[PDB]
Amino acid sequence: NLKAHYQKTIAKELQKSFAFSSIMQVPRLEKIVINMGVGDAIRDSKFLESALNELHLISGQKPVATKAKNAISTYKLRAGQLIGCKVTLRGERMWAFLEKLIYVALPRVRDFRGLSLKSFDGRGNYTIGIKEQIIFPEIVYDDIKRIRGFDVTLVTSTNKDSEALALLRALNLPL
């Protein structure tokens, strides 16, 4: 597990990198979320079931679909008619589904060169967007009539973004 490498080395590594003398002033990665935004369900294209099933396939978390909290007449989404879906995964799942991306998925992208120079919030978060869910291994070629991407976030327990730089660098992310 990727957690093994963390709890084996990272605490000491980032404790010595910055003069802290507090074993857990080191940033801790707290949760990861997944969102897709299935808005092609104007009224019922496939009623989101394909999205739910595939997101269940990729992650052990059971997917949940959010209901619209707004009323928009520009589309057929007003005061209800749940769209999209959401995973908030943690525990062993958090550490493992993370590396399963970085060691399996991103080498299988159309072009994976670099990011994260400007994608930080400035308060200790980070985001990754994927234009297509067909790239990931936990899926077969058959899918919804449309193939969509993903929105994943890394939120840690520090507010200073350079600490997030340090944590993600200590974890070997593609910068």
């Binding site: 493992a96 399963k100 291994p137 936990e138």
Partner: peptide, 18 residues
Amino acid sequence: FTIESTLKQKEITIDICG
């Protein structure tokens, strides 16, 4: 690598490795 996935395809091979 060995973490977790759908368990129907244990020890799967992929081209572009870690």
